[PDB]
Subunit: 115 residues, 4 copies
């Protein structure tokens, strides 16, 4: 599992459950093509987005649909979504964990990259 | 000044200076049009991006070129850039401050709307 | 102004106003002595805590009463307060800005030393 | 396992390994008494600090020795340590995960609290 997303809710002190996540890969022309998508589980995690074989070198965008999340909670948040754009696997296969911490007007994102 | 950006460096404990910032507005056809751009100053701030007249309701993207910033410091960064996408909503008089706190493998962004 | 505190509210996207802040210096015998205190202003800032003459090298603790802040907003917080403990080091002319970004179950603090 | 600590390094994009963590409990007089201590593992996690039986209601302070961590890496950091002070178990036993994200001049801490 080379690409994992973990999302926490800083207002409730809990995992952010059912957050939609879309991943895109920058194509040979500089259009973002859809790559994978999913929703966080009860633990706020999203696994199984892709495989080592499919997860080739490139620039990827992970888009976390934070707006829908906060709206469903009755909070009107600032951001449309949180997005994380990174070059992946440019010197060999790595495992990427993209973690995000969400508040209505703020989010933080961190990457843990393992060999 | 309806839109201000402030960028801090969490590694050195200093403003992030000379960081390129590009602002885009979403156009009618799903597409991002250049709207404003600048480089953060010595205090890590960027002002005078736009005016109240010009800054109408819409979806905006603030793109902070964090990669070049870290590269200049000889530190290999994770992100291609930091992006902040938000709807400017205009109901009442509103100043938007977009602040980013930069680390090589992490960033945080917060909006202060006053 | 050698020491400044700024507190932001990540839930409402606003300065955190009227937040009590207490600053302590570590004394000779391992113990924390009151040093300065105040309440953040309408811009979520606290200035004039101390002077250059008084702010000597030492270990300082900045305690931000985040609990009362959230309680006033009817939101149950996790932390008793936020604490920031650092050595003031004085080598060269230095202003310390301590910024805190508050959420009910999380906070971030960063230091800007310029 | 009612109290867990997870520590990440935002400079290296990796878990923060071998970070010393001391936990204190506020005593019947308002002195912090030592409660538990340990070091983060290779995954940046610290488990087994305490048991449900021992982890009674009270105010706890988790102190993360960030200074030693950064010094061992040749970075001179700002903070002496990161500390998280919270009331625990005041309406029944909960499981607490204290997560911290470390940079030389900044850290963030979040709590995930589960039933
Ligand atoms: O800011 C944070 C961010 Cl963005 C993520 C985490 C975090 C907490 C628990 C886990 Cl298990 C992981 Cl992977 C992360 Cl990255 C913790 C903090 Cl304090
Ligand atoms: O995480 C933070 C972020 Cl994203 C921003 C700031 C911050 C520091 C100084 C200033 Cl002047 C401002 Cl407006 C901000 Cl929002 C402080 C922290 Cl701790």
């Amino acid at each position: 599992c080379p690409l994992m997303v973990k999302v926490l809710d800083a207002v409730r002190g809990s995992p952010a459950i059912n957050v939609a996540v879309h991943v895109f890969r920058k194509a040979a022309d500089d259009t973002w093509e859809p790559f994978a998508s999913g929703k966080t589980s009860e633990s706020g995690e999203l696994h199984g987005l892709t495989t080592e074989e499919e997860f080739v070198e490139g620039i990827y965008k992970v888009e976390i649909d934070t707006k829908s999340y906060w709206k469903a909670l009755g909070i009107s948040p600032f951001h449309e979504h949180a997005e994380v754009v990174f070059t992946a696997n440019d010197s060999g296969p790595r495992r990427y964990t993209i973690a995000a911490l969400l508040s209505p007007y703020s989010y933080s994102t961190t990457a843990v990259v393992t060999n």
